[PDB]
Amino acid sequence: MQVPFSRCCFSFAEQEIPLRAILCYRNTSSICSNEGLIFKLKRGKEACALDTVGWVQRHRKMLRHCPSKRK
Amino acid sequence: MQVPFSRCCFSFAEQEIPLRAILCYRNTSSICSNEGLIFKLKRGKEACALDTVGWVQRHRKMLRHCPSKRK
């Protein structure tokens, strides 16, 4: 019965986000990939970041993938 | 510091979803609107549905907007 929505990043973070501010990262859905990465921030906040930009790549290596559930 | 990801529906529910199966709805992000509606189902499941289709409109009227948080 599920037709999940896609997670897309059409606008990206200009300023560097401190690594300590991020919990984990999610990839954008493949249909709208656009080289974006989602960083999950504290208290449920979020930031799209473009994965071709230097700092985003280095931050990605120092984080784990955001967990999901099935309940 | 936030650059939220967009919620987009590029694929939609063909078959009618029972109203009792849905918790609430959310709108797709305006940048990728495409006349889609998101229905939140049980155990965190989800369904994109096209708002020009009859049943989706009638289901929408009998539901409330999905709540969000800020913590």
CA distance B58 to B12: 16
Residue range B1-71 in CATH 2.40.50.40: yes
Size of interface A-B (CB pairs under 8 A): 91
Structure method: X-ray
Work out the minimum CA distance from B5 to partner chain A, whole angstroms.
Answer: 5
Nearest CA in chain B to A69: B44
Work out the minimum CA distance from A11 to partner chain B, whole angstroms.
Answer: 7
Q: What is the DSSP letter of A21?
A: G
Cβ atoms of A41 and B69 closer than 8 Å: no
Name A44's Cβ contacts closer than 8 Å, sequence gap at least 6: B69, B70, B71
Half-sphere exposure of A2 (CA within 13 A, CB side): 11
Residue B47 is which amino acid? A
Residues facing residue A40 across a β-bridge:
A24, A46
